[PDB]
């Protein structure tokens, strides 16, 4: 048991946690990876244990974030070998937080007691992962709470959020890392009863369906090549693609959805098309919701370029100044704007709170692409009278990789936390309809030009996570943190 070998063990145990997420959905690999990280940091100095946490997260992020390489294969045009260093530094920067959790736990709790692994680690894991999702803009990717979307602890999610499952998974795997090292038989069962108490919670229908307001919703997946997506011209076909695919559905569907940045043009430059399209949807009796880029003039006669969603048709008449839209708030850290003080067009940030959308008597809370993984921001924009959850994205990058599935698995948790049907539309990613409990009602394969049409029923409940948020976990994190820190 030297310092050299424990680095390679955490490197592989970190890669074990990758299997916990989609498409693998091996949720025990989360507990196994949590046990491998929590046990390898026993009776060590902080500076040598931080190397284990740095090598553990580097195995986790090095296996679950490697799909960002093909993201640069389309944007940027780099020679190749430089993109690989970015993934390492991206994993290194994210591993600094994993190493920050391993170093602090070794300074205050060098003793291998149940207090460290069942009280301190679940609370410190909350503050560590939160800082990794707060510094700069935030990147809370690969949280083992999302692995329980198809697992046992899914009943605990609508009560205290996805981050609270990270708390209990660390709390269970902590007592599981105890009984595996100390060979004691008590915390093994104490881990299970704390793991078994949230199991009877996955049969509680917090919501209530409204079968009368059942509608037929259609969502279009145009499958536009990313190499020709933003190309000048060619968009005459893209509009002809959607319209020839949307027109036969305008008469009978009550709501039609197009993905993010579907119309590759400024909103002001395609006005004669939308005024003609809106007037046709009203005759048929349907509502259309699509995403488009907006270069809007501010009061200072300067343009703020936004990533926007607009509404058309019956129940939502079109207008360039209409309040029935949604601007992107949480921007991509480097795909749109620059976060640093200075360098060495930029997208503008929208409001943090926006009223839900409207379309033929339907209330929809929106979230563009990356914004769906922010459970607290989705909860804040959420309103009681909301009929469905809505999310549109463009996963053209990360092609043929495991990226979109990890992204897709996190979006299902938002429907479970809020008990609302989640409608998701993408360019070539996982386009599906998710029920109020993370169940996949319908889904179509990737890399295809198809249209998804199904029936949905709204809900009108209020989950404990919708009333409260992640603060009940912070209280449990505070009490677990305030009590365990004082002892040292
Ligand atoms: C053939 C279907 C199975 C594909 C298997 C991919 C490997 C299994 C998953 C390992 C983790 C993700 O693995 C990732 O997969 C992508 C996508 O194919 C591959 O990526 C590589 O091939 C793809 C084409 O598919 C290129 O566009 C990309 O620039 C290149 O890096 C690499 O292998 C790895 O970056």
Author numbering: 8 to 351, 363 to 506
Original paper wording:
Construct 1 (Lnt-C1) contains a fifteen-amino acid C-terminal tail that contains the His8-tag used for purification. It crystallized in space group P212121 using the vapor-diffusion method and contains two molecules in the asymmetric unit. In one of those molecules (chain B) clear electron density can be seen extending off the active site C387 side chain that is not seen in the other molecule, even at lower map contour levels. We interpret this extra density as the thioester acyl-intermediate based on mass spectrometry analysis on purified Lnt that identified a palmitoyl modification at position C387. Although mass spectrometry identified a C20-palmitoyl; we could only confidently build half of the lipid tail into electron density where the membrane region is expected to be. One of the striking features of chain B of the Lnt-C1 structure is the position of the long 345–365 arm that is at an upward 60° angle to the membrane. The positioning of this arm in chain B is made possible by an adjacent chain A protomer that makes crystal contacts with F357 and F358 that pin the arm in this upward position. As aptly named by Lu et al. this arm could be acting as a protective lid to the otherwise highly open active site when in this upward position sheltering this reactive intermediate state from the surrounding environment and deacylation. Although likely due to crystal lattice contacts, the two molecules are arranged within the asymmetric unit in such a way that might give insights into one possible mode of apolipoprotein docking to Lnt. The C-terminus of chain B is in close proximity to the essential W237 at the entry of the substrate portal of chain A (zoomed box Fig. 5A).
Lnt performs the last crucial step of lipoprotein maturation in Gram-Negative bacteria by N-acylating the terminal cysteine of incoming apolipoproteins to form the final mature lipoprotein. In the case of Lnt, the nitrilase domain catalyzes the attachment of a fatty acid derived from a phospholipid to the alpha-amino group of the N-terminal cysteine of the apolipoprotein creating the final mature lipoprotein. In the second step, with Lnt now in its thioester-acyl intermediate state, the alpha-amino group at the N-terminus of the incoming apolipoprotein attacks the thioester linkage to transfer the acyl chain to produce the final mature lipoprotein.
